[PDB]
Amino acid sequence: GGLRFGEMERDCQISHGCSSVLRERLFDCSDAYRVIVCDICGLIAIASYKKDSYECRSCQNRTRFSQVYLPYAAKLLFQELMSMNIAPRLFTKNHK
């Protein structure tokens, strides 16, 4: 595999109106990837999803956190941005 889900293709779900099919065939059926974001400066943490240890060597956080679904696709880009010294803060809900 796999197949191929063109730009063309996606523009057609949108016509019908399938939020969920769309979301399923792009952020699930390909890159099902989850990461954990700091609430102040929205960035990858020192997450462990085992010993509930998150911690943040910067904003000094250990209690305030939120989780985000992103494609490893997305992941790379945000990371690749870090190398260009720019910080896409993912300011989630009130967790801002």
Partner 1 sequence: DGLDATLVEYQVFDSLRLSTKQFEKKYRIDLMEDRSLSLYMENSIENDSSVQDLLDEEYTQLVADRELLCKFIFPKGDARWPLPVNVQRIIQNALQIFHLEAKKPTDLLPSDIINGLNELIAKLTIFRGSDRITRDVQNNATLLFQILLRSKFAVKRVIMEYRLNKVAFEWIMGEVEARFQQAVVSPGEMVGTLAAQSIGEPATQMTLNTFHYAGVSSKNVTLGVPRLKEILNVAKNIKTPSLTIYLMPWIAANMDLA
Partner 2 sequence: SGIQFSPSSVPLRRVEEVQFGILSPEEIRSMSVAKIEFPETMDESGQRPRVGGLLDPRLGTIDRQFKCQTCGETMADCPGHFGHIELAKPVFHIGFLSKIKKILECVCWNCGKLKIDSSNPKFNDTQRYRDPKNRLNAVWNVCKTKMVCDTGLSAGSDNFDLSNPSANMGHGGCGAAQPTIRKDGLRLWGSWKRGKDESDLPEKRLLSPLEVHTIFTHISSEDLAHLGLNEQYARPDWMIITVLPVPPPSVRPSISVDGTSRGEDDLTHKLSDIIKANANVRRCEQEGAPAHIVSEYEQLLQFHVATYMDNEIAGQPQALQKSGRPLKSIRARLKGKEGRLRGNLMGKRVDFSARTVITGDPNLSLDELGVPRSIAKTLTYPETVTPYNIYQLQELVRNGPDEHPGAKYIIRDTGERIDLRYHKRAGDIPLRYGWRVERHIRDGDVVIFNRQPSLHKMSMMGHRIRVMPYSTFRLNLSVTSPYNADFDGDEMNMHVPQSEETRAEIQEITMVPKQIVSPQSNKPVMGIVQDTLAGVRKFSLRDNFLTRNAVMNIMLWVPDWDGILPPPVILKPKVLWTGKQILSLIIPKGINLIRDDDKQSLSNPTDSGMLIENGEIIYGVVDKKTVGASQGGLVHTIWKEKGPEICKGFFNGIQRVVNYWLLHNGFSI
Partner 3 sequence: FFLKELSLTISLHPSYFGPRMQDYLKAKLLADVEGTCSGQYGYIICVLDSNTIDIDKGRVVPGQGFAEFEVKYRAVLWRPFRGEVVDAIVTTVNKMGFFANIGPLNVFVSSHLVPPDMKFDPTANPPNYSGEDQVIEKGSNVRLKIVGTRTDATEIFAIATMKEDYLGVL
**From partner 1, partner 2, partner 3, none, interface partner of 63 (C-beta below 5 to 8 A by class):** partner 3
Q: Is 18 annotated as a binding residue?
A: no
Please name the residue that has the structure tokens 């911690």. Answer: 55
Q: Is 29 annotated as a binding residue?
A: no
Please check whether residue 16 is in contact with residue 24, taking contact to mean a CB–CB distance below 8 angstroms: no
Q: Write the DSSP string, 34-76.
A: EEEEESSS--B----SSS-----TTT--SS-EEEEE--HHHHH
Residues that bind partner 3 (rule: CB under 8 A) add up to a total of 5
Stretch that binds partner 3, among 4-12, 20-28, 36-44, 82-90 (CB under 8 A): 20-28
Type of residue at 31? D
Residue 11 engages partner 1 in binding (rule: CB under 8 A):
yes
Find the binder of partner 1 among 1, 2, 6, 17 (CB under 8 A).
17
Most distant CA atoms of the chain, gap in Å: 46
Residue 31 CB, shortest distance to partner 3, in Å, is 14
List contacts with partner 3 (CB under 8 A). Answer: 20, 23, 28, 62-63
